[PDB]
Amino acid sequence: EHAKAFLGLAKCEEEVDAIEREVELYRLNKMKPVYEKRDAYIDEIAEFWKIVLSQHVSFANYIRASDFKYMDTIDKIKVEWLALESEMYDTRDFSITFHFHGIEGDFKEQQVTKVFQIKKGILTSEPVPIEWPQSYDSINPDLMKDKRSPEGKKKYRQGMKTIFGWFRWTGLKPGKEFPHGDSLASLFSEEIYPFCVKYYAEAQRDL
Amino acid sequence: AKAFLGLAKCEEEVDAIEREVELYRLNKMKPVYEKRDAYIDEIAEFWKIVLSQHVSFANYIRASDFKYMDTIDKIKVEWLALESEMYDTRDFSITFHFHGIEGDFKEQQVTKVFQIKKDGILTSEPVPIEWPQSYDSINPDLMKDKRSPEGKKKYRQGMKTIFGWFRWTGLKPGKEFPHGDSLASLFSEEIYPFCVKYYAEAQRD
Numbered sequence: 347e348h349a350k351a352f353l354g355l356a357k358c359e360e361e362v363d364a365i366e367r368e369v370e371l372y373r374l375n376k377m378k379p380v381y382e383k384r385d386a387y388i389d390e391i392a393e394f395w396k397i398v399l400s401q402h403v404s405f406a407n408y409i410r411a412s413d414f415k416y417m418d419t420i421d422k423i424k425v426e427w428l429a430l431e432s433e434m435y436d437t438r439d440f441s442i443t444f445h446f447h448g449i450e451g452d453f454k455e456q457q458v459t460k461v462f463q464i465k466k467g468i469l470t471s472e473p474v475p476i477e478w479p480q481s482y483d484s485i486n487p488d489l490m491k492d493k494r495s496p497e498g499k500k501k502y503r504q505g506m507k508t509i510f511g512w513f514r515w516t517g518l519k520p521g522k523e524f525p526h527g528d529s530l531a532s533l534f535s536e537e538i539y540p541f542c543v544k545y546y547a548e549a550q551r552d553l
Numbered sequence: 554a555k556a557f558l559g560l561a562k563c564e565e566e567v568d569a570i571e572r573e574v575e576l577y578r579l580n581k582m583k584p585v586y587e588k589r590d591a592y593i594d595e596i597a598e599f600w601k602i603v604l605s606q607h608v609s610f611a612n613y614i615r616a617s618d619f620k621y622m623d624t625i626d627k628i629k630v631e632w633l634a635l636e637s638e639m640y641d642t643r644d645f646s647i648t649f650h651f652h653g654i655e656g657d658f659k660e661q662q663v664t665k666v667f668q669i670k671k672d673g674i675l676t677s678e679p680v681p682i683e684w685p686q687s688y689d690s691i692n693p694d695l696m697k698d699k700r701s702p703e704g705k706k707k708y709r710q711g712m713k714t715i716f717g718w719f720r721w722t723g724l725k726p727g728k729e730f731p732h733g734d735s736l737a738s739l740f741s742e743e744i745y746p747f748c749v750k751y752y753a754e755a756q757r758d
Contacts, residue, residue, distance in 0.1 A: 347596035354592040355749045358585055365581045373574045380566050387559035543560050 370437040374427045395420045401545040408530045413509045416453055419446045425539040439463040440535050453479040462531045469528045473514035575642040579632045600625045603748045606755040613736045618715045624652040630745040644668040645741050658685040667737045675734040676723040684716045
């Protein structure tokens, strides 16, 4: 037709994009209190997270076999959507907090929060401190004296492939960090945390 | 055990909230689509262009159907959950207005309804539509012979046309228009919601 129509169709599209974010915010606002109440019940189920993480179909493929003993110490996982804090954040942005009860003589009891947010878009993050297990001293990047050597590079990559390497993932150095750090982050915010109860129930039906 | 009971209740609330969010979206989008479609009724061959621009739509119908699809000057999808709580938020009706082709395809408006039956599957009911005279030999309601090898070929040809799709129900696997459910979702999930995008993309080329 003419231009006058193409214009109306232009403003309509912008009204649609605005509606979509309003809808996402609407959902986030409604779900926040339900998660709080749900997580209160979860905090009363020992090894809830260990069971959920084992039931997930692909979680295990992201971390090293040896990491599981440390993952088993997770007492709580909490995901919070940042768009609820400010419209300056994408509705896909979230922080994830882990509480590890630790292992005497090997892994420190600690709480760690990592923040994921969209840039220019793709998920990105900043490194967050976490006390690696003593067992990992030889593959720990901050204790790694020899990274250059062909034997050092091997150990370096090994450490970077552990869940602890994921905590320093940023998404800004393609191929240089923990592999698929963004996919793992999305796994937590879109599948593991939202549907943990469904996974747990499934593990129950299996006696 | 009181925890498991609490979790069960939370999951129930989650499902209730998801429906509420979907209805919230549907209600907000309704007036926008109405205004949008008003501007659309001002662009000639709008739908003809969108349907030819879509990447997979043409793969669902027969080449011979293109000329009839080109006569569509109006497509309207309506979500039934806005009508009642007994409809799934995925249930919808799609209304087509064909301008027709004189002496071959009658000018007509047809509405087909798609609804979930049990996470459930999309189903529909046959809806009346006047097939083109050119399709007389492959029209299931006119064919006398649907048994011979030749009669069966003509039968299948007709059932694979867009007119056979209006007859699709999703309740007779392997006996109806192929992938009638995917085509339906194409309309409600891509073609109708993003038609304007397809129209702009067609302008550049």
